[PDB]
Amino acid sequence: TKKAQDSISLTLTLVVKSGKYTLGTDQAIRNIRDGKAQLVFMANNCPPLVKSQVDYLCHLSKTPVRVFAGSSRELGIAVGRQFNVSIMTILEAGDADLTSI
C-alpha cells in the first residue's frame, strides 16, 4: 500500500528523466501494433470503447497493460504535466526498474 505507491511514484519519475515514453492515445496505438511498448498505463476514467480497444491490441502483442489508480488529471500530475493524460506508454525504462507496476 503506502510502501507500494511510493515505488510506483518513484518509477514513474525515473522514466521521464532517463528513458523514452509518449503521452496520449494515438501515440499509444501506433507503438503497440509495432511492438515497441514495454508497458502501457491507463487512467481510471479512460473512455470505455477506447479502453476495450487498447486491451485487445495489447493481448495480441503481449504488451502488459495496467491501470493507474486515479483520474486522468492525476496521471498528468504524476508524470509532471498541466494537462490530462489518458494513456501513458513506456518505450524504454532507462533507470526505472518497472517491477513496481
Partner RNA sequence: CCCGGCGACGCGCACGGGGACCGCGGCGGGCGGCGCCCCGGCCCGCGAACGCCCCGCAGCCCCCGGACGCCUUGCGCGGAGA
The contact set with RNA (CB under 7 A) reads 22-28, 30, 45-47, 72, 81-87
Give me Rg for the CA atoms of the chain.
13
**Helix (H) or strand (E) segment spanning residue 65:** strand 65-67
- Cβ at position 76, least distance to RNA in Å: 7
Identify which of residues 85 and 93 has a Cβ nearer to RNA in the complex. Answer: 85
Q: If you search the block for the grid coordinates 487498447, which residue do you land on?
A: 54
- According to DSSP, residue 90 is labeled E
The identity of residue 79, as a single letter, is V
Identify which of residues 73 and 98 has a Cβ nearer to RNA in the complex. Answer: 73
- Cβ at position 2, least distance to RNA in Å: 28
